[PDB]
Amino acid sequence: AMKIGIIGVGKMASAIIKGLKQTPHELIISGSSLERSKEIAEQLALPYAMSHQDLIDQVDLVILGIKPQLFETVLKPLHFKQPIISMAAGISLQRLATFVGQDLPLLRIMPNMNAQILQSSTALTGNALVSQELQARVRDLTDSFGSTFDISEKDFDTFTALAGSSPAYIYLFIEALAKAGVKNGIPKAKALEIVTQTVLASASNLKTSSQSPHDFIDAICSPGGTTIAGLMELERLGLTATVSSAIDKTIDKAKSL
Amino acid sequence: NAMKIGIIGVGKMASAIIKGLKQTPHELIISGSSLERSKEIAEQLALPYAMSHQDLIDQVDLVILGIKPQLFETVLKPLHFKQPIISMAAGISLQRLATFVGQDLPLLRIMPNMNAQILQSSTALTGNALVSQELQARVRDLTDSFGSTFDISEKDFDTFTALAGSSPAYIYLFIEALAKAGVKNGIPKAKALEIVTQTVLASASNLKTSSQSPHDFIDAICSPGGTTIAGLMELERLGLTATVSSAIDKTIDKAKSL
Amino acid sequence: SNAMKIGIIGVGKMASAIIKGLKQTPHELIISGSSLERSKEIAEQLALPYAMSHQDLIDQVDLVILGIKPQLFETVLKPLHFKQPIISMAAGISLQRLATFVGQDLPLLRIMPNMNAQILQSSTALTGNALVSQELQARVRDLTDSFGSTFDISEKDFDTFTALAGSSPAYIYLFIEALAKAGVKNGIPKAKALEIVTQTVLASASNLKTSSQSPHDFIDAICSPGGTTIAGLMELERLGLTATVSSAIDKTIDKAKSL
Amino acid sequence: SNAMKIGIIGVGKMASAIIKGLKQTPHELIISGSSLERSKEIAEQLALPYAMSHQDLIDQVDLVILGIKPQLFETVLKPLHFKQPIISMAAGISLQRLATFVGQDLPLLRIMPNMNAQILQSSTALTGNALVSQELQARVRDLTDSFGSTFDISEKDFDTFTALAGSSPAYIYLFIEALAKAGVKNGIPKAKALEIVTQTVLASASNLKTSSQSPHDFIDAICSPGGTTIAGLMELERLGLTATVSSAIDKTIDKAKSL
Ligand code: PRO
Ligand code: PRO
Ligand code: PRO
Ligand code: PRO
Ligand code: PRO
Ligand code: PRO
Ligand code: PRO
Ligand code: PRO
Ligand code: NA
Ligand code: NA
Ligand code: NA
Ligand code: NA
Prior knowledge:
alpha/beta; binds proline; 4 chains; ProC C-terminal domain-like fold
């Protein structure tokens, strides 16, 4: 039952703590100021530390919940002495070692906001210093707020797009369907209820089936019907290309960070 | 209080609601396009068949129509109905149905979707002037057997057809597009599909139980100077929302024309 | 005998293409061109008898096949007096309309063949009016089976079939030519580029035909992750290949409807 | 005997597809997966011997075929010690690069097959380095001829061939699926729409193959003036079918180049 410290606590880091609370481990947090630390510690019902170093001094494992562009500034004056888990997009384990040390085991995760309901899809990977013992204990941590995917580091930026960023794309999609409902006479809340329930069921039906999404499309598209009319419209306007180009842009950005 | 329910025409959609119907106390019987088809689907479904549509009509408390909208006029006019009828067909009004079957029948429309297969359809229900408070409740019990039921007015049925009946296909094309982007970028199709399907399911579930709007979540996920806002502005640039909305418009136009 | 006499009024490219198949049947054939001069000319090319006029043809024949274009039906048919079942191959003209030109007392049939009739591999739709008996339709199916395969298609689906089977060979050729031209752009001689793609098209279609896998199933198989195929496929998506084809089929069908 | 022992390192979809053809040869086959577990698993599926490791495979075999993806060549090959001619099927990796991974003392060959190897109708390019004798190339051609046809293609043309023959089946499938989907839109069941178009695609390509006419010659033949085909063809032009295909081939080739 180790002691875990979280440096930087924004929305992603907060979403993860709910799940970490259901582990046997003891937790402590450290924010961007002492006042911010207290604020967040209050709403999570967890202790906080007097500084990042004070956190580092008492803790067996550190989780970094700060944004990637703050890594160099925030991390360089600190002296780490335990394994570190980064959740940051774009920053390689090699680059992290440059900031914190060549003598530490380092892990990356890529969770998403679904950690809020303990249903994150989280990628996990570690550097050469990560024993199978340590990787296992971290996997136990990630499994506490959803599922875990053994993902080689070269695939992290893609996974960031497919799983970390995609909930927002999924929400834009649902929102577009609901807005189309409003355009055509159905109240927003009601359209959103219908659409969300349909998304949920469709995804569950796919999960438990051996059929492909394209097999399902075939079943739903009655000849001369309404679905095939709308599907050909989605083809005309480039639905697939649009999603793919957005994914590419997500990945480009991850790379340049 | 147990009915005999007869199904005329059994396509993919009619087959999909059968599972739910089988969990009801009611007795069921079917009739396809020929006698040969009738026995093939009786075999497939472990349900008794009638010798004809009229034979079915003559012995049944309630009729569900599973035939395609384009076949209504041809198949229904020769027949003599003697009980409440449920149509699941896109784009055919109860008024228009009444001209096919009689002005003396209680008539209901439903709009289900393929998720009836897992008993998780989102189904619209409405009835004509001749449906009692009590009959619509009896039918709501039917539709609840294969998912959820929405009491929506008939003027809204074409929009509901797009939002719930057709949209699983649009959802699947979206899922497939995310997964193909994974393949393009070096992730095996099976794996890519597992990740995104799980993310879609969790995202929808979080939305449902949260008080936050879709746009509220987008704000939370879009870290300043991050990856999500980059991809989000690309979706804006290429017209994700306009594209979806135009597709729904086309779906509705088609329903109107049917 | 089982042999009947078959007369063909108007012989363009499509009518010529089915002749070869009709020659492999037990039947006697005779033709009639747009003029007596045209008739002799093409009777020579095909090695077949000609008639002195359409009505002369009609007076001796057991079955008429019309090879004239849809636009000429009214002009050419109305003056004639028909006495036997007629087969039309024209796009966009219903059996109901044909009967108004030709008579309400005749068995009438529609076919929709394609240029692959040339090598006896047409994909041909077949339908008949209420006057066509089972025996007659089977006799006509035997005719259509002589230059390809035959599909029992409802008349309401004829315009769509026209697009999918009658017009699509041209669309398939354009697509094949596009791939070969892309080979030329990138350093491969036209002839060699056409040999490679045509062979790949043939093999791919046979594979599809004998498999239980869908086209999309095959696409998943071929698209190695991070590979060359998925890159080309996403470019097809970006530029709207599927939308383009579907829009072209809609225009084909709109045309069939307005004819 | 004339029988040699052939070992396959890495067996994905493409390597599996050529196995069937290799079984119809007189040679002895052995495989090696990405792990000992994977090896046993797939040796069962194919009914073939497996090796305990890639090097174990190498030590007993007369010829190695590589079925691993281009991205893994460096990682997987460098630790191994090869002792025999090697055939690579990987897109975008030159014989020069392969020799830097594997040795300057080996005969090395490249092939570019496609998934039609499944029905023994691959369109397969073949080339060899300076170390490959006439006897060896002929022996390898015999191997490739077992699962399709074989083209003698210069290495400088391999990326283009990859697009025209290796990746294009997926593009052909998308095009076929587009036509069938257009049939669904317009009232024809998917299965039936796919049967009609696939048959038309097959027949059209055979017609082209055995004819002296160009694709464009055929297009002229099919496009009846004021007809349905020319309407659909001008819509193909408007929406840029040819440009789309060619652009997709360029992206395929760019990808091959960057691999
Ligand atoms: O909701 C419906 O009516 C359609 C019919 C086929 C698939 N679902
Ligand atoms: O495509 C159609 O026409 C039916 C009705 C909605 C879902 N499937
Ligand atoms: O996975 C992450 O790191 C991002 C941060 C905000 C939403 N989820
Ligand atoms: O937008 C970003 O940068 C973080 C990482 C994925 C989702 N939220
Ligand atoms: O030629 C090749 O190598 C590819 C691999 C998957 C499908 N065919
Ligand atoms: O997509 C790829 O990379 C492999 C090589 C050509 C066909 N399949
Ligand atoms: O089916 C037809 O009628 C057309 C005429 C020229 C080419 N094939
Ligand atoms: O283009 C046309 O009108 C004829 C009919 C289909 C093929 N050729
Ligand atoms: Na980066
Ligand atoms: Na309507
Ligand atoms: Na017409
Ligand atoms: Na390359």
